[PDB]
Amino acid sequence: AIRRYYLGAVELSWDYRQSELLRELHVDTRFPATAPGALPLGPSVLYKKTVFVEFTDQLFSVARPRPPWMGLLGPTIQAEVYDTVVVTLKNMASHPVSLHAVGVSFWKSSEGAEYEDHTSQREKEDDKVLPGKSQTYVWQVLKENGPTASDPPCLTYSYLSHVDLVKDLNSGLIGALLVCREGSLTRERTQNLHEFVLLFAVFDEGKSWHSAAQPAMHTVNGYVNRSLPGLIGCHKKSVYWHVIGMGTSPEVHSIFLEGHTFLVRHHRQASLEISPLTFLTAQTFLMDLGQFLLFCHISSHHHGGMEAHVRVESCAEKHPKTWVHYIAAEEEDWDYAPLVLAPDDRSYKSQYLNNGPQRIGRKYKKVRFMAYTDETFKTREAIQHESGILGPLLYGEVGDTLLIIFKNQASRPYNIYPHGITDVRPLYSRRLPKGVKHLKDFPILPGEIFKYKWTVTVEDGPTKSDPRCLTRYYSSFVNMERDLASGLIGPLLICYKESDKRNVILFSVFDENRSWYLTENIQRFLPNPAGVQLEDPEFQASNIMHSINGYVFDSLQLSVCLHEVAYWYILSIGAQTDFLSVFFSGYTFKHKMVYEDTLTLFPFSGETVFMSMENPGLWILGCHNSDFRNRGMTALLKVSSCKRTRHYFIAAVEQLWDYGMSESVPRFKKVVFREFADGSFTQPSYRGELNKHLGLLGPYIRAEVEDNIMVTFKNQASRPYSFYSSLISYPDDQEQGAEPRHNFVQPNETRTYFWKVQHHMAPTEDEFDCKAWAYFSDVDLEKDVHSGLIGPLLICRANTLNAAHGRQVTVQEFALFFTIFDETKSWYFTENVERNCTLKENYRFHAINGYVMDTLPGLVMAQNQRIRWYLLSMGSNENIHSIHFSGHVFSVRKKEEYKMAVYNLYPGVFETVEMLPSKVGIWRIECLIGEHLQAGMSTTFLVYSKKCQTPLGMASGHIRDFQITASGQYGQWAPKLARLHYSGSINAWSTKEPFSWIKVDLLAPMIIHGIKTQGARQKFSSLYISQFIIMYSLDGKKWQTYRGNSTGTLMVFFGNVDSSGIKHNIFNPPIIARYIRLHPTHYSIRSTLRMELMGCDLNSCSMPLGMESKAISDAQITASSYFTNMFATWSPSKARLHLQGRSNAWRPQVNNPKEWLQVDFQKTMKVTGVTTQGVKSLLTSMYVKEFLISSSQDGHQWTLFFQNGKVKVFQGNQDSFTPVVNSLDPPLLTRYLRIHPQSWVHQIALRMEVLGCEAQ
């Protein structure tokens, strides 16, 4: 279970289409006149690429054979749970490369990423491997790394070079990582399976390492235009697909397979919705021999390199209805806005819907699908308002047959064919009319009729885990683009067996600049068909109707009844190209057996959602996408009939905001939600520790289910703003009609919201203890989120949220809002003249919670301790962020529980995930969209061990006098005395000033878990601090009050009751600081203090390695000699800090500076110091005055711990009883440590502990 891999970063030439340039393996030396050149050319081009390649051995002589199909893709690495991977990378390239694995565990020596991690330079070799050199890596695959019960037998992850994502990805450094549960060795029937990693990578050769612009290749495994070789699957079997998206900007890919459906998680999906670091395991099953096009389907034919062939080949060894429809393609005049709702117009509405100089406006002639009653087509079946434009609803359960008698009646040859059903032959015959490869592209003529037999089979239908019905569609296919654009579209449900089937919602941009009838419309509808323009980009874009069903800017109003439990069948077929993030106001539909709140839809995609109309009111169905919705895509919902109360006091207030100064400061006016204490919005409930991380985000508003939520919201701020969530449930008040729920807080006004929390606002029994929902202003959805109004609304479950904290407390919880603020769109944008004197790209910030560039504070988490992450993205389509917890994996839950390593955040979606932190240290949260990352979208978190409490040296004098500092001194009662247990005379700090403080500079950032506190006696009175508060700072003039564990304005700590006693307050969101400062607030007679500071370094390596705690068996301790006589035995074994009794320490058989004491940790350890002691014996005292230190990995090679030049000589031990620490400040690794005493007193005699932690 130690899997060894020998990757190397190799450069090669690549033209993308020519397979077998990968004969690197073999000097394929071309002779004639040659048409290449590792730069460009023309007759085929040839690009500089650096990819991952495998090797036979640890000496990189012979490269592996790589398959036809892998292309650029690195070697796939596989591991079961509990194995260990040990990769050796050898860089053989122009540029440097790292190896950063996703979805396994590693040790920071192995993380292959570099950032401000407080990491020894040895643990930073991994971070960048230079040309030549090597680096072994080692990955862990722990139990929390592996798949769940519901997961595939083997999770699809990846690994890449992580030195310059934009460069590294765009140049070919990306391979597959397969983390399977234990049983990567079961005899799969290796006729099916086959299994093919499917990199869906866009490469921007105009910004790979090699480049300067140039072009950007949408590829599959690095091949363009159907050229990928080798994708063969066996016939009546099934093939798995480990799918990895890649790209260094946004962009999504809607991936299809001509005759086929994908099964993922456990759902029948038609396309694969993928986008930068999306990871899937899809499986498909092959019933039809032949060759089928795998391809991305985005209208933008540029999206049109993602096209590869799959060949499938023989290998070796009650009663179902028949539904009948008479349907006609036939032309009509179509009105996009037949409902008098004009007035609203300082907003676009005019442009798309007016007549004159060069606008058709709103009445375009189109062709539709129209249902008739019989073969005569002289009479129409029942139309129905609300589904306008879209053809007749075509239902069909698994097993049924649909007879689509089709008659044309138009002015071009059309056609009708369903995407969804595999088995669609002609009726009666099984053979096609002419040289017709496929019924799909075969047209229907004059007014001919064709008779089709669509048969719905099982493999078309749902899958237990998805809904009773699933949403498809039909359309003419003689010319998909312009036919659909002319309006040939209609809905097709496909369902399961044992006010009926209800609303169909079609999100459709009809580009009337492509509709066959563009010309016909121009003649009839223009002032002078003379004014041609056609590419006058206003006229052109004036016929790009952003439609819902067939209506726009709110003409589709649709009535439901209060508590009508209604299904919604939802499609995105149009020009479109980008995903849609669809929402209903005030409402919450059920998606994957989970209540969500926005529903993201890729092009040519359809989903079923299901909701109960519990919110009386007028609502808008719509788009959430910024600048659609503006362009018409709206629609209306008109409903109408036919234990605690957790009160939060919240206001929208303005501030300045730099999203982070540090490292490189313009400041920006924003407006944000903050919590206040009183109705009298005057006590602003300042936050810290538990909420420092909130950033630009509103406060956590938390309810359980069935209690009530009450937000009093007061608008400060210049503009009017709103508190909306979509959990906000208005009651069946105000009759007379449906009413748009007011909302809208005018400045200074103070509106109040109250609503009970329904089981449907809360976790399914299969979700986590606590669900997250967003809330924001909605007076201008787009403009005033960018301004800054946004927050998390946790809805906890059952009896989970409790205490007097109103919070889980069982689990550490954080909220992360990823988005790219455009201060050009933020209201206060003109007030941000204040700069000095033409592109905006410095007015945009890629900011987690409003901090950019590892600047977001507040992320500290205990060692082993569940952590729940609410992840939100918002905004423009660009915001498809791909969030990674480096070195960690988490679990997402929707009806079942799946392990993941990168969550693919789509705007408007608010997922909740839980992880446990394996490894202590400082770790990174990225967005692996490389552009986003390098624009700052990153931060870090700290996981600490709760078991690394140690005295920071305050009593022990390790803290030198000069670091203690106060403010007044009484006299001779100096702060250099504040040292716990100090004795005599004057023996503490003391000040007669009321307002005072004492301050300790630890000299570097540290983790503090507590403070032990005394105070002395002066003759017969007792002096002590009975009540203090703690301030801390990171730089030294950035103090913040330790509002520890929220509690109130601040944490007031209880000091002492007397001289003697120690009071051991603890910091339970521990303090990360280097200056801590204690402010006496109540003292007896005099503020007076001896104190000790409990704490730890940042990486939690301060605890002993088990010398005193016999955890280092006497066999691991060994020395060069050891004096023994008859009554003595000063054997190494005994050289343990504080050991007592006879012969209690190590003594070399003779004293000389060549002797040494040695410790074999067995494993590699991170030694960060050495405490060291001497001994009293035979009432004659011996100890080691000076020493130096050697270290080793093998036990036969050695290096002395140099420092600042010339071999460190450590102080250590002036007496035979006092232990003395000696931190190693370029901290040692190695498994071997030797102590070399140089100068002593009477006799060399050593007792010690070693300080550090485990490594490797």
Ligand SMILES: *[C@@H]1O[C@H](CO)[C@@H](O[C@@H]2O[C@H](CO)[C@@H](O[C@@H]3O[C@H](CO[C@H]4O[C@H](CO)[C@@H](O)[C@H](O)[C@@H]4O)[C@@H](O)[C@H](O[C@H]4O[C@H](CO)[C@@H](O)[C@H](O)[C@@H]4O)[C@@H]3O)[C@H](O)[C@H]2NC(C)=O)[C@H](O)[C@H]1NC(C)=O
């Ligand atoms: C995979 O798919 C198809 C094959 O089915 C090919 O797609 C087209 O290939 C042709 C060449 O065979 C391209 O035509 C020429 O492209 C030149 C490069 O400019 C491109 O790059 C920029 C980068 O931003 C694009 O924005 C731009 O639109 C171009 O696509 C042009 O210089 C050529 O311009 C012509 O018109 C100008 C204007 O007067 C003249 O000055 C020129 O001399 C020339 O006559 C020309 O357009 C075509 O662009 C490709 N289409 C697309 C969508 O890229 C792929 O090449 C094929 N193979 C791959 C991808 O490797």
Ligand SMILES: *[C@@H]1O[C@H](CO)[C@@H](O[C@@H]2O[C@H](CO)[C@@H](O[C@@H]3O[C@H](CO[C@H]4O[C@H](CO)[C@@H](O)[C@H](O)[C@@H]4O)[C@@H](O)[C@H](O[C@H]4O[C@H](CO)[C@@H](O)[C@H](O)[C@@H]4O)[C@@H]3O)[C@H](O)[C@H]2NC(C)=O)[C@H](O)[C@H]1NC(C)=O
């Ligand atoms: C405000 O300050 C308080 C204290 O001042 C903090 O409260 C406790 O803080 C820590 C974590 O920050 C917790 O203390 C202990 O947690 C340990 C976790 O180990 C258990 O965790 C797993 C979860 O996977 C359990 O399944 C398993 O039992 C592990 O042992 C344990 O040492 C203790 O947990 C268990 O102890 C007994 C078992 O005999 C049970 O009865 C307990 O209910 C619990 O299951 C121990 O609890 C603790 O979780 C915090 N809460 C407490 C003590 O109520 C706050 O966290 C802090 N507020 C913040 C940070 O917001």
Ligand SMILES: *[C@@H]1O[C@H](CO)[C@@H](O[C@@H]2O[C@H](CO)[C@@H](O[C@@H]3O[C@H](CO)[C@@H](O)[C@H](O)[C@@H]3O)[C@H](O)[C@H]2NC(C)=O)[C@H](O)[C@H]1NC(C)=O
């Ligand atoms: C809000 O508006 C007022 C100024 O118009 C300022 O606070 C308010 O100051 C007035 C001064 O007398 C106080 O009287 C009250 O005014 C409110 C209008 O907000 C009115 O409804 C009451 O009946 C009463 O006459 C008032 O106490 C005080 N407002 C509050 C809420 O205490 C202030 O400049 C403005 N800004 C904010 C943030 O309140």
Ligand SMILES: [Ca+2]
């Ligand atoms: Ca590292």
Ligand SMILES: [Cu+]
């Ligand atoms: Cu991102």
Ligand SMILES: [Zn+2]
């Ligand atoms: Zn694409």
